Structure 1
């Protein structure tokens, strides 16, 4: 009673995804972004493709580069990917890691000097995520020890043990900040879904390589927090910002976050092997995916950006929600068996190929307007790394491999 696309279709999609990853995405990052002046990678690449080796460099971007090349090396084996990950790792430990107070700085100057020394949990999470993946890829003990040290600092200085979840930003010496905003766009509230999603993500990857008992409890608490406070069963959307007691302080809807969470929550529960929690997580996951299908898509199947605090639909197609929809829709199909989710995955992929990818300049456009016009945004910057689209391709390749195996051997 399985309804499954035929083998030609599954294999054709898998091949296209692999080609996009290796011949466009990773090719762009390995060739255009390495910096031989300061080492590591440039912090910015302009709309015209100009790299800027003197621009400030963000911890999140650099951790994303490390994660992506580590993950690609682990799954595909190409030696270039290990070389690129090694390059990212060396710069990261040298300059982003605070050897004195622990954790990673927010931003360094191109030459490595600390430039913004705040310790934001979002950045600490990406550090944990990337270091754990590099350990998974190479067995490096320093990388795992560092990830563990950062985990301890988050729990020590940030955990809210009265309410659940985490204070999201501290200064260099882990004294917490009033302003935990990631950027000007974010509500000036003490708790965000966004930061907590990436804590969950990091903690799941850390647990894969270091199954500590207390970590399992912390990861489970986060899953439970999502189900209780963040996911909204009446709407099928995540609430974005809260006070310390998880009282909602936002009405915005982010389709990209919804569909990303839809698969990351299940990844986390499965890493834990938490069979008791799984049915509820699966229910919320499928709902998030259906709500995204019904409300967050253009007729071409791409994802809109958000519904803002005053209700306005932002119809811009940003690069990362398309990536997350590819994974989230394939995941929804795997969980539910409902082929409408595969069709949605196929539609977003076609959009990615026909509109989101920048065939001219390489990689993917950050933003495409509702009329199809690309915006002249930076190709690489503090917030645009290779992780959403790189991961989306790697995930799709493996998920399609598993779907292909539903035709049993004889």
Structure 2
């Protein structure tokens, strides 16, 4: 470590404690349970907004992880609140697994079962089990794992969307021209992430075998060799629908794969993953880091240079991870520069706010919600928590 790294860590911990945690605490829905589902750009909460399961599981994960790292008893209480809503409203008492979305009162809105949702369920529940010791949470996590492996898994990866009763259907994720993507790297990335967390807490051989399997899939099918990029949206055989690169998902994958690699008993696979993770970091830095921040994506030859909150959060973690593995200061420099960028342009300076969704290529704020089914405390919360865990 170093003075810069120490001050960096102190800065993130202060930010987490004084900005992020109090904000998400304010979203607690004491009327019907869970957390309110929407807050607009002008900081107005829609109490009656539909509640997405991914958002609730991400809040569950976040407050659970805050307790596990910071030992905040209030955070544990907030996790409990999210867990109660998960157990009571999102968990399907007939067919098991987690609904996609419910009304603000908990009435099912979309009962279909997506692997993306089940994975975040495992991630959040496993983290909550660590925080609370609640064996009910562990039971549900284990059951979600069982269902993914026995009902959803195929030879090429996971079929991603199902009817409520686990009969397979076509996926809901589309290309920018409206074509259904049967395999998506982001669904499979969150399966890897949740299985890592599960195995960390529950060292079952069954979970180990599944974790190695999905790591192998990333190495053999999803990564595009030597390019530093993963496939994004694919057909059922991992052929790309469109030549597209998601720089945020690349750099996120780099450090999540590196993390999974730590648990691998297969030393050949382990060194392959570690090399892969490093190549992604190197190429992300060269291609996507503009000296200040990371750009978003490139579709064919069309580059989106908007600065998106979660992309910048994952860049900080991924470049810091690259620094730790290489001791090359250029990665550390990039991580800290990205964090100063976030502080200057994405952290909202209004009262009772949090992070902005994005600024455009010229760094002007765009009207987007502060809280939505897809905007959570998970990417930015985890950025802070990761640095805190990594720095002694």
TM-score w.r.t. structure 2 length?
0.96
> In the TM superposition, what whole-angstrom CA distance separates every residue of 1:14-35 from its partner, at most 9, and x where no partner exists?
111001111111111012x111
- Pairs aligned (count): 391
- Which residue of structure 2 lines up, in the alignment, with residue 15 of structure 1? 10
- Which residue of structure 1 lines up, in the alignment, with residue 91 of structure 2? 97
**For the residues of structure 2 that align with 1:97 and 1:182, how far apart are their CA atoms?**
26
SS in 1 for 2:153: coil
Whether 1:322 and 2:316 are equivalent positions in the alignment is: no
* Ranges in structure 1 where 5+ consecutive residues have no aligned partner: 402-410
CA shift at 1:370, angstroms? 1.6
- Which residue of structure 1 lines up, in the alignment, with residue 256 of structure 2? 264
RMSD, matched Cα? 1.5
**For the residues of structure 1 that align with 2:175 and 2:141, how far apart are their CA atoms?**
25
Whether 1:112 and 2:106 are equivalent positions in the alignment is: yes
**For the residues of structure 2 that align with 1:90 and 1:371, how far apart are their CA atoms?**
43
Pair 1:85–1:274, CA change in 2 (3 A):
farther
**For the residues of structure 1 that align with 2:145 and 2:117, how far apart are their CA atoms?**
12
SS in 2 for 1:373: coil
- Could you tell me which of 346, 359, 373 is aligned with 1:368? 359
- Which residue of structure 1 lines up, in the alignment, with residue 245 of structure 2? 253
**For the residues of structure 1 that align with 2:277 and 2:354, how far apart are their CA atoms?**
29
- Which residue of structure 1 lines up, in the alignment, with residue 136 of structure 2? 142
- Could you tell me which of 358, 367, 372 is aligned with 1:381? 372
- Which residue of structure 1 lines up, in the alignment, with residue 303 of structure 2? 313
CA shift at 1:400, angstroms? 2.2
- Which residue of structure 2 lines up, in the alignment, with residue 333 of structure 1? 323
Answer with 216-225 or 175-184: which moved more.
175-184
- Could you tell me which of 25, 32, 37 is aligned with 1:38? 32
Whether 1:81 and 2:51 are equivalent positions in the alignment is: no
Whether 1:218 and 2:213 are equivalent positions in the alignment is: no
Cα pair 2:254 2:281 within 8 Å, conserved: yes
Cα pair 1:120 1:169 within 8 Å, conserved: yes
**For the residues of structure 1 that align with 2:124 and 2:30, how far apart are their CA atoms?**
22
SS in 1 for 2:391: helix
**For the residues of structure 1 that align with 2:176 and 2:144, how far apart are their CA atoms?**
26
Cα pair 1:330 1:399 within 8 Å, conserved: no
CA shift at 1:185, angstroms? 8.2
SS in 2 for 1:134: helix
- Could you tell me which of 185, 188, 206 is aligned with 2:180? 188
- Which residue of structure 2 lines up, in the alignment, with residue 71 of structure 1? 65
- Which residue of structure 1 lines up, in the alignment, with residue 288 of structure 2? 296
> In the TM superposition, what whole-angstrom CA distance separates every residue of 1:233-259 from its partner, at most 9, and x where no partner exists?
231101112222222323110010000
- Which residue of structure 1 lines up, in the alignment, with residue 390 of structure 2? 399
TM-score w.r.t. structure 1 length?
0.92
Pair 1:242–1:184, CA change in 2 (3 A):
closer
**For the residues of structure 1 that align with 2:107 and 2:302, how far apart are their CA atoms?**
41
Cα pair 1:187 1:241 within 8 Å, conserved: no
**For the residues of structure 1 that align with 2:179 and 2:56, how far apart are their CA atoms?**
25
- Which residue of structure 2 lines up, in the alignment, with residue 47 of structure 1? 41
CA shift at 1:325, angstroms? 0.7
- Could you tell me which of 116, 122, 146 is aligned with 1:128? 122
> In the TM superposition, what whole-angstrom CA distance separates every residue of 1:311-359 from its partner, at most 9, and x where no partner exists?
2111111100111011100100111121111111111011011111112
- Could you tell me which of 236, 243, 248 is aligned with 2:235? 243
- Which residue of structure 2 lines up, in the alignment, with residue 199 of structure 1? 191
* Ranges in structure 2 where 5+ consecutive residues have no aligned partner: none
**For the residues of structure 2 that align with 1:275 and 1:46, how far apart are their CA atoms?**
48
Cα pair 1:38 1:53 within 8 Å, conserved: no
**For the residues of structure 1 that align with 2:86 and 2:341, how far apart are their CA atoms?**
34
